[PDB]
Structure 1
């Protein structure tokens, strides 16, 4: 099939411009075209074979600037192009795709913590607001399952969250679901074999190595095997029925480690290293 894991931006001493692609078949890395503006705390997603980099910020020694930007990478041309910006900047954003539309969830603009949600239509190059979440969430994770969107954990401006809620696109409304076992902001959230996984993050004291998964029909969260390395602000994605987690912060180091979860054996292994340690990347597969 020949699909790659793309990692965009990140943070080490400042926000970064890197776009690199890992091939899990032959263990190779490509160095592709730099972002036009450095970005960390962003999200990656794919629609119709194009890579999108959504929100984040530029934390340099010269200043802090939260991003409302949407930028589109075409793997055929190795070129980044600007798209219409979001209504508001969103640092530590969550994103999901339903039916070829991009949903931008939560995030921060300076001291402001958003509950607002907006939807991008690629064919019209336009954003529109939809119903807001029940809870303000920054450092939030997002998963799409059965044409519904789930927002998991984060920070509401006062409290770090174990809570999660579910968006119904046809009805345009949110409902709270069963809360996680562990409080998590800056966790990796994805979907594997009809379950929502939450890996790592920060519980208010420590960076986590624990991993839990939500079965939509049993309505219960269950612990699986933990990761080797504790990490917050990790990238996460799924390639060929396996979870890959990229980089993050362990409370001392910005990690170059990539771990892989095999659901059949319930084991994690270290598969490769990024070319340099970083946190707050956006990641997607195409």
Structure 2
């Protein structure tokens, strides 16, 4: 059985929680806290290990952007530090290709990064790769057919509908078709042949809309909207369904977890997180 792991997040201050949800029975398990509270991070998995990447510790005693990479082993219930990134990256996006972690964009104070770097677990080393064509924080990242996509975000001045693709063997970014909606702090994932962008902030409102990019047609199509408007949501895929976790709706730090069934084009409520929060990192791996 595989669990949906939610790491960190924000309610009043940045959080250290690691909790795991089991779709097979509705249960939540609280696991070992992150060593350092963080929101605006990303989660990913490589080799059955959960990684927490970037973020920011928003705390009453100071706000510190994170260049940290930390590894959680479900077999031991222990977090271990890895090599830090070249730069702090709050409101980060990440994607995994060929067992390597790409860290994309994010902020360091008023610096909005276009830079991108790649982590190799076997060497515990980060190396920079070609930068994006656009500065993006709150960037959605996903991987399809061993290509890396950076979707929407905030460039320092404007929220973006634009998106771009990284071609690893050319070390090159190229724009793709823009979304039909400006989205910053959306949830972005892959399902089947499509990149999905769910929710986010358009500069005026938190969004419930959802659209998907078919790489074969190079077009974006809206699907059913989520039941809750949400920015700074966590998103992942478990057994062919998209799950979205928490976020912010202009009013509440959501505990809502919803899931999308692509065959029925429907969202449904599945569970509540143990407490409302935004800016989590989420990924899926084996039970502890």
User: Shared fold by TM > 0.5?
Assistant: yes
Q: Could you list the per-position Cα deviations for residues 159-201 of structure 1 after superposition, in whole angstroms to 9, with x for gaps in the alignment?
A: 1100000000111000001000000000000001110000000
CA distance in 2, matches of 1:166, 1:201: 20
SS of 2:169 mapped into structure 1 = coil
Deviation at 1:128, TM superposition (A): 0.4
For residues 91 and 19 of structure 2, what CA distance do their matches in structure 1 show?
Answer: 21
Give 1:54 deviation, angstroms. Answer: 0.2
Alpha-carbon distance between aligned partners in 2 of 1:225 and 1:182, rounded to the nearest angstrom: 14
**1:166 & 1:149 partners in 2: Cα distance?**
6
Distance, in Å, in 1 between the alignment partners of 2:279 and 2:158 is 21
Aligned residues: CA RMSD = 0.4
1:217 Cα offset (Å): 1.1
Cα distance in 2, alignment partners of residues 98 and 173 from structure 1: 15
Distance (Å, rounded) in 2 between the aligned partners of 1:125 and 1:9: 23
Residue 240 of structure 1: how far off its partner (Å): 0.5
Q: Distance in 2 between matches of 1:147 and 1:193?
A: 13
CA deviation string 1:38-89 (max 9, x = no partner): 0000000000000000000000111110000000000000000000000000
Residue 170 of structure 1: SS of its match in structure 2?
A: helix
1:175 maps to what in 2? Answer: 174
The normalised TM-score by structure 1 is: 0.99
Q: d(CA) in 2 for partners of 1:10 and 1:71? A: 15
After TM superposition, which residue ranges in structure 1, 4 or more long, deviate above 4 angstroms? none
User: What is the SS of the residue equivalent to 2:170?
Assistant: coil
CA displacement, residues 67-124 of structure 1 (integer Å, 9 cap, x when unaligned):
0000000000000000000000000001000000000000000000000000000011
CA distance in 1, matches of 2:108, 2:84: 14
Deviation of the 1:280 alpha carbon? 0.2
TM-score of the two chains, using structure 2 as the length reference? 0.99
Q: Deviations over 1:208-243 (max 9, x none)?
A: 000000011111100100000000000000000100
Match of 1:240 in 2: 239
* Number of corresponding residues: 285
- What is the rounded CA distance, in whole Å, between the counterparts of 1:246 and 1:211 in structure 2? 15
Partner SS for 1:4: strand
Long gaps (5+) in structure 2: none
In the TM superposition, what is the alpha-carbon distance from 1:256 to its structure 2 partner? 0.3
Corresponding residue of 2:10: 11
